[PDB]
């Protein structure tokens, strides 16, 4: 797709039989979700943003489908106000910024 | 141009006659820049993100050049760790996500 930015670039994602939605986020190094369904044990990670720094839960090798495109990579679970797909996964689906 | 996302999408901008660099962020509703002086009257605004809220000064109808592309709109100024161009100005340069 070619997605304009007049609204939030929210897309359908699927992880483990669960349909969610997340924001295609070029300003995020990482993919951060508020919750994942029963994802098991995780690694502690610190990330930062405009307001400060937060503790997140790192899960590696997650099978995720983004707007129909299959990707494998790291998903963080953390107190993000919106579910975000970061560059770690955006590159995997061949996503670019164009103007 | 076409910008891949293997690294942060930082680009050259020009604002208040000064060359700066800023992160093209599809996950930012608004444009937030580091401390600088801008013309006109500002209003107090708060913006959210990862790590909490920050206090910014809102300047309206500001001219910004993003990779030589002219855009007029709202620029927030405050204690951001990185200059961020949000959707409010990305739309003004016809920036799209493509995959």
């Amino acid at each position: 797709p070619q997605i304009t930015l007049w609204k939030r670039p929210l897309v359908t994602i699927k992880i483990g039989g669960q349909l969610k939605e997340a924001l295609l986020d070029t300003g995020a190094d990482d993919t951060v979700l508020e919750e994942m369904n029963l994802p098991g044990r995780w690694k502690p990670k610190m990330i930062g943003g405009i307001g400060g720094f937060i503790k997140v839960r790192q899960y590696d090798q997650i099978l995720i489908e983004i707007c129909g495109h299959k990707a494998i990579g790291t998903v963080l679970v953390g107190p993000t106000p919106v579910n975000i797909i970061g560059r770690n996964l955006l590159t995997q689906i061949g996503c670019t910024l164009n103007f | 141009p076409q910008i891949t996302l293997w690294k942060r999408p930082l680009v050259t901008i020009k604002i208040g006659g000064q060359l700066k660099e800023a992160l093209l962020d599809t996950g930012a509703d608004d444009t937030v820049l580091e401390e600088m002086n801008l013309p006109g009257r500002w209003k107090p605004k708060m913006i959210g993100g990862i790590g909490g809220f920050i206090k910014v000064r809102q300047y309206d109808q500001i001219l910004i050049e993003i990779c030589g592309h002219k855009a007029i709109g709202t620029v927030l100024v405050g204690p951001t760790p990185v200059n961020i161009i949000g959707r409010n100005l990305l739309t003004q340069i016809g920036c799209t996500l493509n995959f």
Binding site: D25, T26, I47, G48, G49, F53 | A28, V82
Partner: peptide, 6 residues
Amino acid sequence: XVVXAX
């Protein structure tokens, strides 16, 4: 409004 992650 949010402005998303270092």
